[PDB]
Design a protein around this ligand. Structure first.
Ligand code: ADP
Ligand code: ADP
Ligand code: BEF
Ligand code: BEF
Ligand code: MG
Ligand code: MG
Lengths: 417, 417
């Protein structure tokens, strides 16, 4: 008796099971209400019920166990967590809790937690003694997260160009700067697919705030990982809540020496949401940005770091420029002094239908020698010195024509000499 | 005895009928008052009266049935809908209701609804069980909505250029960016005529907010569809109300697997109206735009989506640029990074009296391979690569001179090779 197991079951089988259990007509009923009635009827027989979810401690002291399939939205099937157990096990926002639950009695509206069985997918004896995320020693990117497929596919050209322009390692904090209508969607899809193919052990999390739902359901059915999104039909409060829950879960996972990867596509939208939810202080800067509005996105971005004791946190955010709004322009670069990695995309190259439209000149990675060998770094330096004199479109055409001849970049580097 | 039937009748015949029924002199009376008196006299004999309209639920709990011929304006002949029936049939704003009505008794001012016969042009048993619009899975444009006439007319050149620049499919969410005095009116007229000619099965709705009455009555007598407009003589409150009613009706139609097409021509004017009706919060951004003013137009724009279960919602809004106001430059923009189709028009080409004055270079459609075949996409790519080096005016002249030689674009593509 698990909550996620009943959530994954279809509607027809749940209706059939409820009709066999002998309850009210479930055809004219919601799936969540059907599951609730089935759990009630199964607990009336004396059997136990189990559930799971991410903890969201409220300001009063209690909390609930949000579900991932609903993008951490307030649902009727949330498991109530008393503050006594929180104080007894030192629980915090983001801790994954899995234990026995019971249906609400007369006068209650949510399931109660009796005994916790597993904390953060581990024993509670290992979670009671742990080092906080704020005390971990940061470090630079040491492990190399190669994005090249290696299967010789035609779509691998984007990953090869990305590796030649800006290699990505564990704990990297980069930025994907690109004007609208440049190809950010396809680039993010390719990055997510390459991450899921090359490094399936890492925890991939794609955050899409204030996006077109069709794109949400497309990304959810395309990438092999977790997708937490919030369409534009929701207020900025839900955006802030989702961002906080995601970053808290990422911190709790990193605290257990896990490799978390966050592919953010709405850093600008997140900053707009934070500027909308912040109370007015009577002081407005140039472009309509509050003085204390960028602090929360600043911390959300700076949360990414590489841990020496174990694990890492990678955050790749895509910033929006040339959107016609001065607020986004002020945000983007305020954040430019940030992202230890900038991958610029050119609109002029995208208009020529030359995919990918990557600005190789302005791209780059700091401390790239820690992720590449000596000969590889020398070859990349020679390639950059050869590409720099040529124009952007000409350099892109040259790179595409030279990478189409071979499958691996090593052969291209060997033929360049 | 139908309301719309009496509304379509002329004034002279209604006056004659009222004089034959033996009532007060109807020559010095309004047509609506004449219809009201005729309905009263016909109901005094014991016969039944029927009406219809779009439901507009008020904040208190009751509602009225607005009429389409009055642009959903508050009229004396609105049918009152009690909240009891709303609670009994789960009615919402936008549901088309058609049932028996009765004249108001002593102390009443509006017609009452006794029994509902048809809901959303369908049986109530099919409307009681339905999936909300917020739960439908979005998708990209799959079905091709070809705009080419095919009759070899001289006006078909605009549709041919539009198809070669940006093909339109079901569920598309585009933008027509053009400075003033460019030819937006003729272009919108041609688009509406091509939609009514090629795809007469789709529900066409043209929304004109804050425009001149002459243009309104011109569009109403030119296109073959529904025209809901609101001239500048009305406050922004009526603009917001009309936009809400139109989008709610569109959502209710899409919920019944219908293909709705909305040709918006005032996205900038709608954003200005929303910025005017929003209460001041003491925080003004660059250009005079409120922080929470663009949220409602953002949702109105993002409502457009393609449904996998059935139906679609297409919204083609025309944004205004270079109007001398910085608010529109932020308002029209901020919207640039939202849609997935931009059809730019050049003022320099319009000054040369070269119609249509379309910027073929900056135009385009994302995921265009889902609406065109392989050979068609290759021919469009070759045409774009040939047109790109030439200047805007030169490319437009070349395209016009090459399309004037033949009737179909297939012959042009075959002759280009
Ligand atoms: N690698 C690519 N190959 C082919 N087309 C692409 C590629 N990247 C982008 N595009 C085109 O650009 C359009 C928009 O790209 P997108 O990633 O949505 O840009 P952004 O996210 O910056 O708005 C897509 O619909 C696609 O047709
Ligand atoms: N396809 C066309 N053919 C001929 N003239 C046109 C065409 N499109 C626009 N025009 C001219 O431009 C004028 C204004 O066009 P309009 O569509 O009103 O531009 P906008 O809507 O951008 O203000 C029209 O009065 C018309 O004379
Ligand atoms: F319009 Be893109 F997604 F920035
Ligand atoms: F003056 Be146009 F209608 F933008
Ligand atoms: Mg995008
Ligand atoms: Mg116009």
């Amino acid at each position: 008796m698990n909550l996620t197991e009943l959530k994954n079951t279809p509607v027809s089988e749940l209706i059939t099971l409820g009709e066999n259990m002998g309850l009210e007509n479930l055809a004219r009923m919601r799936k969540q209400d059907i599951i609730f009635a089935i759990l009630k009827q199964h607990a009336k027989s004396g059997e136990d019920i189990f559930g799971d979810g991410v903890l969201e401690i409220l300001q009063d002291g209690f909390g609930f166990l949000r579900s991932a399939d609903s993008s951490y939205l307030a649902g009727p099937d949330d498991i109530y967590v008393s503050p006594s157990q929180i104080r007894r096990f030192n629980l915090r926002t983001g801790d994954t809790i899995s234990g026995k639950i019971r249906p609400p009695k007369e006068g209650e509206r949510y399931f109660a937690l009796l005994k916790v069985n597993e904390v953060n997918f581990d024993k509670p004896e290992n979670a009671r003694n742990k080092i906080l995320f704020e005390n971990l020693t940061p470090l630079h990117a040491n492990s190399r997260l190669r994005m090249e497929r290696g299967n010789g596919s035609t779509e691998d050209l984007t990953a090869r160009v990305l590796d030649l322009a800006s290699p990505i390692g564990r704990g990297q904090r980069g930025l994907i700067v690109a004007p609208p209508k440049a190809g950010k969607t396809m680039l993010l899809q390719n990055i997510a697919q390459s991450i899921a193919y090359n490094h399936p052990d890492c925890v991939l999390m794609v955050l899409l705030i204030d996006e077109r739902p069709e794109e949400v359901t497309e990304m959810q059915r395309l990438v092999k990982g977790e997708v937490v999104a919030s369409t534009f039909d929701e207020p900025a409060s839900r955006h802030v809540q989702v961002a906080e829950m995601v970053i808290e879960k990422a911190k709790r996972l990193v605290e257990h020496k896990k490799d978390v990867i966050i592919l953010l596509d709405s850093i600008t939208r997140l900053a707009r949401a934070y500027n909308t939810v912040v109370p007015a202080s009577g002081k407005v800067l140039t472009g309509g940005v509050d003085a204390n509005a960028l602090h929360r996105p600043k911390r959300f971005f700076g949360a990414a770091r590489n841990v020496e004791e174990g694990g890492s946190l990678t955050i790749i955010a895509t910033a929006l420029i040339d959107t016609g709004s001065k607020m986004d322009e002020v945000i983007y670069e305020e954040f430019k002094g940030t992202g230890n990695m900038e991958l610029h995309l050119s609109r002029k190259i995208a208009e020529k239908r030359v995919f990918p439209a990557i600005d190789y000149n302005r791209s780059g990675t700091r401390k790239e020698e820690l992720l590449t060998t000596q000969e590889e770094l020398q070859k990349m330096w020679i390639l950059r010195k050869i590409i720099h004199p040529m124009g952007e479109i000409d350099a892109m055409e040259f790179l595409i024509n030279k990478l189409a001849m071979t499958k691996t970049n090593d052969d291209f580097f060997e033929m360049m000499k």
